[PDB]
Design a protein around this ligand. Structure first.
Ligand SMILES: CNC(=O)[C@H]1O[C@@H](n2cnc3c(NCc4cccc(I)c4)ncnc32)[C@H](O)[C@@H]1O
Ligand SMILES: [K+]
Ligand SMILES: [K+]
Length: 543
DNA sequence: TTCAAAAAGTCCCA
DNA sequence: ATGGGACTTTTTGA
């Protein structure tokens, strides 16, 4: 995963541009996932320029025979550059690349082929740079995950990622007054799994700068969203973070010769965040958005979690075995008591759901194999081998033809609100048709004790408003270009209000629902009603 | 027993 | 061929 050169140079310049080579001519620069040496080779070039530009000052202050230009190459490799990686071939290539920068006496190069997370590191380091590996909870082998849970528990639990541990290792082995700069996924900035990691970073290092690329495609043909984190262990009372957040995700990364030109430009916005004021959540927004977010939080007395019951959709474990088109002839084998309406995330619009085109065979209600042999033999059994490889089938908890996570039917077969799990905008709809769905659609229904305060029509009105689209996206988890995570761990934290505008907001919502359900939809008037509703909500929240 | 999180997403076309 | 757009499964720890 080759890191773009402009970012590599920026990271190295970040850690080394103001190093006092005269005061300390023995800086230790480390990359614990160096690979072929994208960062370390640049570190060599930056160090070599630094030594040659101060070669005569060094010669005068120290051993004058040791400090010559001819001796710079040797000194850098013996005492300055350190790298670690698990790939033997990459280390071998990097060793040759460092050697080719210039046998006399066989210089030794501090490159280790090892697990960076298991190595007994004999000393701390002045500067650490690089791009660690990212491995999620699905693609990480179970034997290694037990080690991470037992030894890296301060940052790695549950659905945490591998690069959390590289953050902990880098922070642990950084010298006092040292500087670290890495490029990692951005998701830990907001994700629920990153809470322990954020607590660790906040209370161990001073975060100098965060570069957030949002959904920009930094790595070509890689579906990941990146950020650059720069931190130090310097004694300072400032504790203020420079945040450079991109404004246009469509931009290409090579607009200028250097990254810092892009950051200072009109493609990025800059603002400051007080690190001491960071809660367990990192709300990195400008003053206008902070005021906007704080107004809504203070004005709203209730949250969605207070008034609603949230649940994830069906997880069959093999969709091809249980989901059929409503026009599929094989449904003539299945009694209608077994069939449920099935929708995908794209079927969720604002305020209403598209008509179902798929049916779910709720195979849990099938009592035994002998009574409905045709359904099992001709429909579900076509994927029996894959069905039996599901975890709950291996342990015997689930029968091979049963849904892996069937949930409760009564939760779905009722009036409820559904929203897609990943979307570019708020899309909350009222479901009237007892729709079932997979985990790409989340549902909630209102608690009985809050039905006389909040109706479904009022909720979809304010939740689909432009005010709440901006409001939710302030702290939402940015996944990829024009995609946010609409998950209960943040959707249920949305705060809602009840005031003098309740009735008209609800009435406008009913009008929109009435038009959206017509045969000849005058979608233009829906937009006009939405604008009027947004004005009511902004009036209610005083913004 | 059984909840919900997780993009080095995935797949496609031009 | 690559880059950009539409769309989103089930494995997994707790
Ligand atoms: C996306 N970028 C990479 O994967 C690079 O990082 C190196 N890289 C991976 N993982 C490493 C590690 N520890 C974790 C580890 C080790 C062994 C098995 C397992 I599963 C996990 N330590 C040291 N370099 C490690 C790789 O060799 C590439 O150059
Ligand atoms: K001298
Ligand atoms: K991206």
């Amino acid at each position: 995963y080759y890191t773009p050169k402009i970012i590599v140079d920026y990271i190295v310049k970040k850690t080394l541009k103001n190093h006092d080579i005269i005061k300390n001519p023995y800086p230790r620069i480390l990359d614990i996932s160096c690979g072929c040496g994208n960062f370390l080779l640049e570190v060599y070039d930056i160090l070599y320029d630094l030594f040659e530009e101060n070669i005569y000052e060094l010669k005068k202050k120290y051993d004058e025979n040791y400090w010559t230009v001819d001796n710079i190459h040797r000194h850098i490799l013996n005492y300055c550059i350190y790298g670690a990686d698990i790939d033997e071939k990459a280390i071998s290539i990097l060793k040759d690349s460092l050697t080719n920068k210039k046998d006399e006496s066989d210089i030794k190069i501090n490159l280790f082929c090892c697990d960076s997370l298991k190595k007994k590191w004999r000393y701390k380091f002045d500067y650490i740079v690089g791009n660690p590996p990212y491995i999620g909870h699905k693609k990480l082998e179970k034997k290694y995950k037990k080690f991470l849970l037992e030894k890296y528990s301060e940052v790695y639990k549950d659905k945490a990622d591998l690069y959390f541990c590289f953050y902990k290792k880098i922070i642990d082995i950084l010298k006092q007054g040292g500087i670290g700069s890495v490029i990692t996924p951005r998701y830990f900035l907001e994700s629920l799994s990153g809470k322990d990691l954020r607590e660790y970073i906040k209370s161990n290092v001073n975060v100098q700068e965060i570069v957030d690329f949002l959904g920009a495609n930094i790595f070509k043909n890689i579906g990941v969203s990146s950020c650059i984190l720069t931190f130090d262990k310097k004694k300072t009372k400032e504790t203020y973070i420079d945040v450079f957040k991109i404004k246009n995700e469509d931009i290409c990364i090579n607009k200028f010769e250097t990254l810092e030109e892009l950051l200072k430009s009109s493609k990025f916005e800059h603002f400051n965040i007080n690190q001491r004021l960071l809660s367990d959540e990192w709300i990195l927004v400008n003053k206008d958005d902070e005021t906007f977010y704080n107004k809504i939080q203070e004005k709203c007395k209730y949250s969605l979690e207070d008034i609603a019951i949230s649940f994830q959709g069906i997880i069959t474990g093999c969709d091809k075995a249980f989901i059929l088109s409503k026009d599929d002839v094989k449904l003539n084998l299945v009694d209608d008591k077994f069939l449920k309406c099935w929708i995908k995330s794209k079927n969720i619009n604002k305020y209403i759901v598209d008509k179902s085109e798929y049916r779910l065979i709720y195979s849990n209600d099938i009592d035994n194999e002998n009574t409905n042999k045709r359904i099992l033999d001709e429909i579900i059994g076509l994927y029996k081998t894959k069905l039996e490889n599901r975890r709950e089938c291996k342990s015997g908890i689930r029968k091979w033809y049963e849904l892996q996570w069937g949930r409760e039917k009564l939760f779905f077969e009722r009036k409820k609100i559904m929203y897609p799990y990943k979307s570019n905008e708020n899309r909350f709809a009222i479901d009237y048709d007892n729709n079932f769905s997979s985990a790409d659609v989340y549902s909630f229904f209102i608690k009985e004790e809050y039905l006389d305060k909040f109706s479904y029509e009022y909720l979809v009105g304010i939740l689909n408003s432009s005010v709440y689209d901006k409001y939710f996206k302030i702290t939402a988890k940015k996944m990829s270009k024009n995609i946010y995570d609409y998950y209960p761990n943040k959707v249920m934290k949305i705060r809602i209000f009840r005031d003098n505008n309740y009735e008209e907001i609800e009435n406008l919502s009913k009008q929109i629902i009435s038009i959206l359900l017509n045969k000849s939809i005058d979608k233009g008037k829906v937009e006009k009603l939405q604008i009027k509703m947004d004005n009511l909500i902004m009036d209610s929240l005083g913004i």
